[PDB]
């Protein structure tokens, strides 16, 4: 209840941590630990009736975010773990079910079968990109194919539970919490050309409500970097 980091404070009341391991620290990489370790609340998305899903590429949603974004232009390298708090707040008269899954190395697929998607289309900075429940056509050149039953990666979307995940059932549950360690092949990588995590929120059972209730429900994502450090002097 009412946890705080730096100059921010959020409140909480069930956590699922990564692949079982907890994030920790390692020329010489220096340790900045107090200046940017805080809760970065992104803006809320609206869960409507015929909504399809959302995604965020994770070391890119915190690129225009304050002093964390200032520490990226000053540093060529870095390695960072995360802690993600997702909560949506509806009444007891709404009903639905969300899957909050955190995918490492999620290559997206382009709509044209020869090309590859562009950086403006793969990831909106600190802004959610949307799945669709129709097909993106082949005629446009560089756009992400977002048929949500394939999850944009050419796979069964029901089998996405092999990644570290959490269900949000409005009947019983209210929030989700993930703690994701640093997963990469190299120990310290180029932070400008690599988005090594992807946070997806997909409504399996759609939102429903009776006439009179509030016709859409907000979802609030909060990311807090754990064990961030960069390389330089």
């Amino acid at each position, epitope marked *: 209840r009412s946890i705080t980091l730096g100059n921010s404070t959020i409140t909480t009341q069930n956590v699922v941590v990564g692949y079982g391991v907890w994030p920790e620290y390692l020329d010489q990489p220096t340790q900045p630990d107090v200046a940017t370790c805080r809760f970065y609340t992104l803006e809320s998305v609206q869960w409507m009736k015929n909504s*399809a899903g959302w995604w965020w590429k994770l070391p890119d949603a915190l690129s225009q975010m304050g002093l964390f974004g200032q520490n990226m232009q000053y540093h060529y390298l870095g390695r960072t773990g995360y802690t993600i708090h997702v909560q949506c707040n509806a009444s007891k008269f709404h009903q639905g079910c969300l899957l909050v899954v955190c995918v490492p190395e999620a290559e997206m697929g382009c709509s044209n079968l020869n090309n590859t998607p562009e950086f403006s289309e793969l990831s909106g900075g600190d802004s959610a990109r949307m799945f669709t429940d*129709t097909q993106v*056509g082949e005629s446009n050149a560089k756009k992400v194919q977002t048929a949500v039953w394939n999850a944009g990666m050419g796979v069964g979307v029901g089998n996405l539970t092999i990644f570290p995940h959490q269900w949000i059932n409005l009947r019983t549950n209210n929030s989700a919490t993930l703690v994701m360690p640093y997963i990469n092949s190299v120990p310290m990588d180029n932070m400008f050309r690599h988005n090594n995590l992807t946070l997806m929120i997909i409504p399996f059972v759609p939102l429903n409500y009776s006439e009179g209730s509030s016709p859409y429900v907000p979802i609030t994502v909060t990311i807090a970097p754990m064990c961030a450090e960069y390389n330089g002097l």
Partner: antibody, heavy 124, light 107 residues
Framework: EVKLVESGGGLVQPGGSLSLSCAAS????????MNWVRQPSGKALEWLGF??????????EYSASVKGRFTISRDNSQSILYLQMNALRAEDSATYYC????????????????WGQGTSVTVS | NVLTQSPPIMSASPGEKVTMTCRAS???????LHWYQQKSGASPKLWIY???NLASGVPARFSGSGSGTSYSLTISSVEAEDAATYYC?????????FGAGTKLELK
């Protein structure tokens, strides 16, 4: 009841521009897909494009024949659907309809349930 | 993916059963094939959606069928007020292609 009227057709020199407009009343505008279909004089129908609802982000999906020339949009104030036609040719002389789609289960079958009365566009 | 309708011109007296077919070039799914009806000097109307389901306000004389790459539409008893043109729509990829048109004139 559902009522889709539209307006804006007329005469145009080939190589010019024209803007159609579809006025929608009788339903919530931000919840359905809205299409654009043309038909020439006594020929088959031809689908030009649609525009998804608010929950899918108002993205557009043009046909391969008119991609780059035409533009579908909407007005954010009132429930008016637009069609900016640019670079008109000799074979664009047709009757332009305005259609709507809905979800039948929870799925989106690609049918068009309600149609507009049709405005006519011809070139000279 | 183009659709061919046959026959183009169809004539039949009222009271009998007549049917038309719409054969696709490739495989179209059973849920993405629809039938429309356009009278002379009027806009089309959705008639049958997803190859077997009657729309709203349509009389029960019609029943669509077919699967794979061959689809059909049957009229159990032909009246006088349902003489129009009938188109079939599909979706395998974009765009949404229509049929050629089947014109029904009463005899």
């Amino acid at each position: 009841e559902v009522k889709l009227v539209e307006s804006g057709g007329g005469l145009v020199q080939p190589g010019g521009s024209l803007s159609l407009s579809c006025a929608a009343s009788g339903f919530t505008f931000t919840d359905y897909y809205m299409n654009w279909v043309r038909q020439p004089s006594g020929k088959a129908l031809e689908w030009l494009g649609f525009l998804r609802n608010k929950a899918n982000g108002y993205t557009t999906e043009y046909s391969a024949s008119v991609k780059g020339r035409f533009t579908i949009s909407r007005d954010n104030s009132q429930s008016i659907l637009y069609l900016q036609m640019n670079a008109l040719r000799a074979e664009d002389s047709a009757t332009y309809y305005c259609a709507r789609s809905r979800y039948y289960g929870g799925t989106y079958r690609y049918a068009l349930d309600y149609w507009g009365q049709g405005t006519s566009v011809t070139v000279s | 993916n183009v659709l061919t309708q046959s026959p183009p011109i169809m004539s039949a007296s009222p009271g009998e059963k007549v049917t038309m077919t719409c054969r696709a070039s490739s495989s179209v799914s059973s849920s993405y094939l629809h039938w429309y009806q356009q009278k002379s000097g009027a806009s089309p109307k959705l008639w049958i959606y997803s190859t077997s389901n009657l729309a709203s306000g349509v009389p029960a004389r019609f029943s669509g069928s077919g699967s794979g790459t061959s689809y059909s539409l049957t009229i159990s008893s032909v009246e006088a007020e349902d003489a129009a043109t009938y188109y079939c729509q599909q979706f395998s990829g974009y765009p949404l292609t229509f049929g050629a048109g089947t014109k029904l004139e009463l005899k």
